[PDB]
Every structure is written in structure tokens, then in C-alpha cells.
Enzyme design. Structure first.
Site, PDB file in Angstrom:
ATOM      1  N   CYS A  71       0.797  -1.222   0.000  1.00  0.00           N
ATOM      2  CA  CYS A  71       0.000   0.000   0.000  1.00  0.00           C
ATOM      3  C   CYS A  71       0.835   1.280   0.000  1.00  0.00           C
ATOM      4  O   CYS A  71       0.283   2.372  -0.145  1.00  0.00           O
ATOM      5  CB  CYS A  71      -0.937   0.009   1.212  1.00  0.00           C
ATOM      6  SG  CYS A  71      -2.221  -1.268   1.181  1.00  0.00           S
ATOM      7  N   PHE A 126     -11.083  -4.114   0.738  1.00  0.00           N
ATOM      8  CA  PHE A 126     -10.395  -4.076  -0.554  1.00  0.00           C
ATOM      9  C   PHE A 126     -11.313  -3.809  -1.751  1.00  0.00           C
ATOM     10  O   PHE A 126     -12.455  -4.268  -1.797  1.00  0.00           O
ATOM     11  CB  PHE A 126      -9.643  -5.393  -0.775  1.00  0.00           C
ATOM     12  CG  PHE A 126      -8.523  -5.634   0.205  1.00  0.00           C
ATOM     13  CD1 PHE A 126      -8.002  -4.598   0.966  1.00  0.00           C
ATOM     14  CD2 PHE A 126      -7.987  -6.901   0.360  1.00  0.00           C
ATOM     15  CE1 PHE A 126      -6.973  -4.821   1.862  1.00  0.00           C
ATOM     16  CE2 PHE A 126      -6.958  -7.130   1.256  1.00  0.00           C
ATOM     17  CZ  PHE A 126      -6.452  -6.089   2.008  1.00  0.00           C
ATOM     18  N   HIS A 141      -3.098   7.573   3.104  1.00  0.00           N
ATOM     19  CA  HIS A 141      -3.602   6.292   2.627  1.00  0.00           C
ATOM     20  C   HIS A 141      -4.698   5.761   3.552  1.00  0.00           C
ATOM     21  O   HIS A 141      -4.436   5.484   4.723  1.00  0.00           O
ATOM     22  CB  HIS A 141      -2.473   5.268   2.529  1.00  0.00           C
ATOM     23  CG  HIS A 141      -2.959   3.853   2.503  1.00  0.00           C
ATOM     24  ND1 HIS A 141      -3.604   3.309   1.414  1.00  0.00           N
ATOM     25  CD2 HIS A 141      -2.919   2.878   3.443  1.00  0.00           C
ATOM     26  CE1 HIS A 141      -3.929   2.055   1.678  1.00  0.00           C
ATOM     27  NE2 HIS A 141      -3.525   1.770   2.904  1.00  0.00           N
ATOM     28  N   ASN A 183     -10.842   0.844  -0.029  1.00  0.00           N
ATOM     29  CA  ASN A 183      -9.384   0.760  -0.067  1.00  0.00           C
ATOM     30  C   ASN A 183      -8.892   0.070  -1.338  1.00  0.00           C
ATOM     31  O   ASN A 183      -8.897  -1.158  -1.430  1.00  0.00           O
ATOM     32  CB  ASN A 183      -8.864   0.019   1.167  1.00  0.00           C
ATOM     33  CG  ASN A 183      -7.347  -0.052   1.214  1.00  0.00           C
ATOM     34  OD1 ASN A 183      -6.651   0.655   0.483  1.00  0.00           O
ATOM     35  ND2 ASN A 183      -6.826  -0.905   2.086  1.00  0.00           N
TER      36      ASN A 183
END
Lengths: 377, 377
Positions: free
Chosen positions: B150, B201, B290, B323
Site C-alpha cells: 500500500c 479491498f 492512505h 481501499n
């Protein structure tokens, strides 16, 4: 103001096998001794390989403990990764310590890392592991290059080049390392691509230290200078090399015309990098050609018209180690510089001023790095 | 002399699913309706996630063939790769074309490419495929960042930075893209790290154009200026995040103390980065953190004392796209400048001058990239 190779280190696992005894070893420990027809096709390639020995982590005992790897098609990526996750960054450490010694500077002066390998992969990567193994600073700027094949040797240099030149005082640690635990397979009639690889692939590890504006007072000594680094895709070559990472490990495919495509296109790649210098004659250079078998050398040789005198270093590595993947080209560089001091040559490039680094891989792709020697005293 | 962002482009698959309806979709299409107790925990997590919708390539019928992917532990790497080998670069192509439209220059001007992905990998990589799809020059210099997790978004910014600033006239194309076909797993009682990951995800892809010294006369326009870029390992965080690429796909493990480590160690990174600018007040900056779920964002903001005014762009992306991995930080940059024009703010940074892009990942590792805004006209 230009990047320079300040040190070079190499290493291999202690265990080695002679090519003369490999066909027996390879067919015995895969229980495929009854494939009499394949044993002949494989043997002929071994004789034609002109490779004397190869180093391996995989022993007769480790394969007994991993039948999945010993069986073609069988799922084995679980077992392959248990080995590679540790041994690859470890073998690298051995190489890094040798180059950090020649460099002769404090560990704290390292500011970047570039690790290149196709053998195994996880998170964190080998670039994190070797950072902790060597005890580098927590603020090192890392760049991980996974699965870029045999041209990655030229890639690593191209990346390190722009790093050292754009960051003042920067010192880059580059590491190439491989391990045949990823690509090992048992013989199979339908997939004869394996036969070529198992009579060729080996492993090893090389380490470099790149840096701009060598500090002679501090004890730094340049070995080679880097003047340029280019990359080119070869026209009409789509599909020539393809490798998939399946449950059986790495399954690769080789087309029958890899060498002709490289052969009939290398001339243009050379012409571009060397016109800024006014070079035309290809024998005025020292070479570090990726030993992708005798064909690739003997074929790139003929096209450019390179005499056997200038392929001594590249053919030497092939004979005493085999194809170590991305580390082969740094191995050949160390071969020159050391051979040159012994034979009393004026420069680290066998007495020549300019040289070239040729890496070849999937694409087709060609990496070309123009180098410059330095005087020997 | 200083690298600048010249254009941004993003995209997702058309097919999307509301978080409202995902728990039904998940336990239904993995044949796991008999796990009722496990389903309630999941339900709870999905409600506290502040995620409204996510886009997936994986539909209900695609899981219906590849039952291996829908069955925990089962070998399914082959099926996953046949999907990822094509779909990932195809998703990146769609994003790149948007960035080139804004960039407004000929495709012949692109000199470098940088692609980052954890979802899938082969040889040649997705950097070769996107080079053919966009019809770029065969002589393009490309970098392949595989499996950097990530934080790869910030790494891609740091590499491209050194390429564009060390090469006259060079123009770099950055691309980030992820696909959940690599990290998808059926629910399991023992491995509860999987359950929390399925609520998080997504799929997506972003693209940027990086280049030094914008040419106004050529029609180029700046968006953000890159002042610096760093990387750091967090002290005493060994094993906090590990991920293995086994036969079942990407098997990851998250220890229980991930947030407290990022939370208490981020302050040192910010002080080191912004000190030469004479900055200490963390609410005088715009951000692009993030979004590794609510936990990360709330923990990072609570330490530095960031107010909800300067975290709108971050949460908006997590709420509308989930994400997406390495592409999240690129999405947020785009929402920052786009939102800025609509609200009448004088700069692309919500009216502020300086800002920071924070990339987090395994190691642990922290990518900080100091950014500067440009005036809006």
C-alpha cells in the site's frame, strides 16, 4: 557528476556439481531414470553447453524432503517459497559484505538500496530483510525489482544511475541474487523447454556500490564510469519469452527463434548508444554480454563482428558458473577489472576506453549501458 | 529543475456493489451460509467501516466457474493469474488515456513509464503490455514495481521524481492499479484477518504525468510541485504485517498492534520532512493519507492533531471507492484539486500552500512526499 562503480562483490553457495555428473544426478533424484529417450536429448545439450560446473542450494537431501518440486506439474509453490524467502536475501548479504569491504567506508554512509531477483517474493521484500541483516539506517530509500528476468541486471544499474546523480552525496547499494529453487522441474516429453533450462540455470549473487563524484581522499576508488543507459523493445518478438508463476512454480516457454530476433536487431541498439561518442568499430570496446547460452553470444558476436579476444570475460563466467540470471553481468564486470590488473593492462577495461553492458530478457527487451574504464597503476 | 504533476486520471470497473448488500453477496457466492455466527461479526464490521460502495471485476458468475477462488485454502493461483495477467493493465490503459488527454501533448514525448501493482505478475510484466496498448515508443525506459503493498503509491512518486529531474525534457507516465482477484478468500473461523480484509479491498487505477520545468508555451499546466520524498522503517515493528504468495493466492497476516505503531511514530517523520520549510503546525497543511480503513486515519490524525476539515478528501475516497491499495493516494490528489476549483479556493491544495502524501505499508514502512500547491485561475 557522473555515476561510478566504486566496488564489486560476488559469491556462490558452497555446494557445486560438475556438468559431467549432472545428467545422472538430475534423472536419479526425480525417479525419471526410465525416460531413456529424454536422457539422450538432455545429454546432447549438456555436451554442447560448454559449461563445466554450477552451484546450487538444492542438494540431494533437500529434494528428498520436497517431492512436490521433484514431481512435474505438482503443486510446490508453498515449499519453494519457504526456501527462497530466506536464502535469497541471505546469499545477497554475503555479497554485500564483500563489496562494502572494498568500499572501505562506514555503513551509515549508505542511503539507497536496489534489490533485483526473480527467485521468490513476499511482503516485506528482500530489500527490507537485507536492510536489517546489514544493519543499515532505517531511513534508507529502497527500490524492489521483482520478476524482471535476465535483463534486470541492466535495469538495476539504470535505476541506481539516476539516484546517485540526482541526490548529492548519495551512495547506492545494488544487489542481484538468484536461486534455482524457483525454476526447477522434472523432465517432461510435452514441455521440452525445461530440458534447456535445467542444463543451464544456476545461482549466485553480486553486489555493487554506485556513487557520484568519488571521494579519493576518503579512500574511494572508481572502477567503471556510467555514461548512459538505454532500454529497447525488439520489433516482431511478441511471445518469444513468456513465464507464468503457477502453483507448480515458474513455468516458462521458449520460441525457436529467440536468437535470430536478437541477432538481427542488436546492431541498431549499439548504433544509438555509441554515436554520441563517434564510435563505429565494435572491436574497440570491452564487453559484458549476458551469457544466455553459447548461441546468444556466438550469435551476437558474428553480427557485430566481435573477435574471440573480447568475449573472454563473458565466456569465462559461463564456463565456471552457468547462467546465474541477473547477477551474471556483474560477475563478468568483476572478471575484467581483476584480469586486467594481473595481465598488466593500462585500464580496467582490458586496455580499452569504452565498453558496453548487454542484458537480454522477456519482451523482447534489451538493456544497454555504456561504460568507461579507469587507469590502473 | 523540480518535478511537477502535470495531469491526473482515474477509473474503475463499471460493476459495483453497495456495502449495504455485500455480506449477503459474500457468504452466498462462497457457499458459506452455514456460518451464521461468523456472518454477524462481518455485518458489524461492514457497518462501522464508513464505506458506501466498492467496484469489483469479480462478479457472481465469474466466481461460479473458478470455485477454487471461492473455496478457502484451495489451490487457485492459476485461475487468478489468467484473470490478472490481462485485466490489470487493461484497467491502467483506461486511466492513462485520461491523463494524456489533459496533458495534451503527443504520445511521442513520453520517455519513461512506472507501473506499480501487487495484483498479479508475469513475464513480461504489465509495463510491457501497457506500452503496447498505448502505442508508446519501443525505446521507452520503464520500471516495474511489484508487490510493494500500500506504500507503492509514494514509491512510484519518488522514482519518477529522480528520473524526470535527472533527464532533460523527460516526461514520466505513472500508473497504479489493483484487482481483488489476488486477495479474495472465502471466510474461515481460524483466519480472522481475512474477514476484516474483505470489507475493505476494492478495484481501481490511477495515472499521472511527471516532468520537470513545465512548458507553458507547449500547453502544459502544473498541478502539484514535488519538493521532496522519503522512506522510513518504523522502530520495533517486525512482523506487524506479513504477506505470502502461496498456491491459494496472497495469504496475509495482521498482528493486533499495527495502529499503535504507526500512530506513535508518525510524528518523527513529519518533523524530519517539514523542518527545513519552517513548518510545525500540522493543520496548516492539506493531506493525502492512505485510507487503510477508519482505524489508520483516526489514529494518525489524533496524534498530529489534524482537524476534520483537512481529512475530507481522504475519507471521501474511502467512502466512495473503498481501499483500492496503491491507487488511493492518487485518487485523493485528484479530489483535492477538483474540489478546490468548484469551491472557489485559490489553490489546488484547499487554499493551503504545502501538503503531504503519506503512504503506509508492510515493514512497517512510511512514504512521505512533501507537495506544494499551484494557483487556480
Amino acid at each position: 557528476k557522473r555515476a561510478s562503480v566504486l566496488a564489486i562483490g560476488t559469491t556462490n553457495p558452497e555446494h557445486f556439481i560438475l556438468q559431467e555428473d549432472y545428467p545422472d544426478f538430475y534423472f536419479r533424484n526425480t525417479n525419471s531414470e526410465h525416460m531413456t529417450e529424454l536422457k539422450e536429448k538432455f545429454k546432447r545439450i549438456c555436451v554442447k553447453s560448454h559449461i563445466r560446473k554450477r552451484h546450487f542450494y538444492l542438494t540431494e537431501e533437500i529434494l528428498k524432503e520436497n517431492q512436490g518440486i521433484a514431481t512435474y506439474g505438482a503443486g510446490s509453490l508453498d515449499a519453494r517459497q519457504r526456501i527462497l524467502e530466506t536464502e535469497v536475501p541471505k546469499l545477497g548479504q554475503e555479497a554485500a559484505l564483500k563489496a562494502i569491504a572494498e568500499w572501505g567506508q562506514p555503513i551509515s554512509k549508505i542511503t539507497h538500496v536496489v534489490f533485483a531477483t526473480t527467485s521468490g517474493f513476499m511482503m516485506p521484500g528482500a530489500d527490507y530483510v537485507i536492510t536489517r541483516l546489514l544493519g543499515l539506517n532505517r531511513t534508507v530509500r529502497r527500490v524492489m525489482l521483482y520478476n524482471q528476468g535476465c535483463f534486470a541486471g541492466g535495469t538495476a544499474l539504470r535505476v541506481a544511475k539516476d539516484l546517485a546523480e540526482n541526490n548529492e552525496g548519495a551512495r547506492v547499494l545494488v544487489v542481484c541474487a538468484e536461486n534455482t529453487a524457483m525454476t526447477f522441474h522434472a523432465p517432461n516429453e510435452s514441455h521440452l523447454d525445461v530440458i534447456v533450462g535445467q542444463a543451464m540455470f544456476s545461482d549466485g549473487a553480486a553486489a555493487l556500490i554506485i556513487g557520484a563524484c568519488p571521494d579519493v581522499a576518503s579512500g574511494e576508488r572508481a572502477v567503471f564510469n556510467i555514461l548512459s543507459a538505454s532500454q529497447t523493445i525488439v520489433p516482431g518478438s511478441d511471445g518469444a519469452i513468456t513465464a507464468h508463476f503457477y502453483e507448480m512454480g515458474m513455468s516458462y516457454f521458449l520460441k525457436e527463434d529467440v536468437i535470430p530476433l536478437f541477432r538481427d536487431n542488436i546492431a541498431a541498439v549499439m548504433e544509438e548508444a555509441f554515436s554520441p561518442l563517434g564510435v563505429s568499430d565494435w572491436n574497440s570496446l570491452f564487453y559484458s554480454i549476458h551469457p544466455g547460452g553459447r548461441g546468444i553470444i556466438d550469435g551476437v558476436a558474428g553480427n557485430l563482428g566481435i573477435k574471440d579476444e573480447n568475449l573472454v570475460a563473458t565466456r569465462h563466467v559461463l564456463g565456471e558458473y552457468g547462467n546465474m540470471g541477473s547477477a551474471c553481468v556483474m560477475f563478468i564486470l568483476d572478471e575484467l577489472r581483476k584480469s586486467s590488473k594481473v595481465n598488466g593492462k593500462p585500464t580496467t577495461g582490458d586496455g580499452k576506453e569504452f565498453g558496453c553492458l548487454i542484458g537480454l530478457g522477456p519482451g523482447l527487451t534489451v538493456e544497454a549501458v555504456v561504460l568507461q574504464s579507469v587507469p590502473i597503476l
